[PDB]
């Protein structure tokens, strides 16, 4: 099946086509039918298998646009590094053109990021230390999050962000949809499924 065969808004498909993307990768073709229906899932696949779109397209499809100034984000994506936060934000901006995506990460001051969050955001893509910093400061508001994504959960474990991640997830509404992506599925990932997800289906691309 091609992207056009999936229940995706015309504007999203147009963006996909423009970016040279027509046919889902295996993780995408298996995950989208469930993720687009609002279901929780765990995606286990080598990096470069197309994991980002498997959660970006659900975020894009689920969220309607909003022009309301200072609005709080309706999606949160956590990633272990600044490099990945920038990459994921780029991709999500590109397939959710109707959404404002704000990236937050270390290696710079607070001022520009706070200014962005104050203006309003529909999705935030963040490293967990910086996100928790802003949560504590009152500038990142997670009370309206409808979709939470943990991207590379095993790297977030290996960089030591367990408490930050759990703290962030705990500040989101339990009504949310949660997607967890992790190449390996260590003990921590399993704890997260139990404690933060709703009967998620596991999709694992082997080889």
Ligand X SMILES: Nc1ncnc2c1ncn2[C@@H]1O[C@H](COP(=O)(O)O)[C@@H](O)[C@H]1O
User: Which residues sit in the known binding site?
Assistant: 23, 28, 47-52, 160, 163-164
Q: Is 21 in the site for ligand X (CB under 6 A)?
A: yes
Q: Is 2 in the site for Ca ion (CB under 5 A)?
A: no
- In Å, how far from its chain's centre is CA 30? 18
What would the x/- binding string for ligand X be over residues 46 to 65, using CB under 6 A?
Answer: -xxxxxxx------------
Closest contact distance (angstroms) between CB of 162 and Ca ion is 6
- In Å, how far from its chain's centre is CA 69? 22
Angle at 203 between CA 198 and CA 205, to 5 degrees: 160
Residue 156: exposed, middle, or buried by beta-carbon count in 10 A (0-12, 13-18, 19+)?
Answer: buried
The span from the CA of 187 to the CA of 207, in Å, is 22
Nearer to ligand X by C-beta: 50 or 113? 50
Nearer to Ca ion by C-beta: 4 or 190? 4
Tokens representing residue 200 in the block:
């998620």
Q: Is 129 in the site for Ca ion (CB under 5 A)?
A: yes
Q: From the list ligand X, its own copies, Ca ion, none, pick the one residue 21 interacts with, judged by a Cβ distance below 5 to 8 Å according to partner type.
A: ligand X
CB atoms within 10 A of CB 114: 15
Residue list for the binding site for Ca(2+): 160, 163-164
Q: Which residues of this protein are in contact with its own copies, per CB under 8 A?
A: 1, 5-7, 24, 26-27, 29-34, 36-37, 39, 42, 44, 193, 198-207
């Amino acid at each position: 099946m091609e992207f056009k065969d999936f229940p995706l808004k015309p504007e999203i498909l147009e963006a996909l086509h423009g970016r040279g993307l027509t046919t889902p990768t295996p993780i995408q073709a298996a995950a989208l039918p469930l993720a687009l229906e609002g279901k929780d899932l765990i995606g286990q696949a080598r990096t470069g298998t197309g994991k980002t779109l498997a959660f970006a397209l659900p975020i894009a499809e689920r969220l309607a646009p909003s022009q309301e100034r200072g609005r709080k984000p309706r999606a949160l994506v956590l990633t272990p590094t600044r490099e990945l936060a920038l990459q994921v934000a780029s991709e999500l901006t590109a397939v959710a053109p109707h959404l404002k995506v704000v990236a937050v990460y270390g290696g710079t001051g607070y001022g520009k990021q706070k200014e962005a969050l104050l203006r309003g955001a529909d999705a935030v893509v963040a490293t967990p230390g910086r996100a928790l910093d802003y949560l504590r400061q009152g500038v990142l508001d997670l009370s309206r999050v409808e979709v939470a994504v943990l991207d590379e959960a095993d790297e977030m474990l290996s960089m030591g962000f367990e408490e930050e991640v759990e703290a962030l997830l705990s500040a989101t509404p339990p009504s949310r949809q949660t997607l967890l992506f992790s190449a390996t599925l260590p003990s921590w990932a399993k704890r997260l499924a139990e404690r933060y997800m709703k009967n998620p289906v596991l999709i694992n691309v082997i080889k």
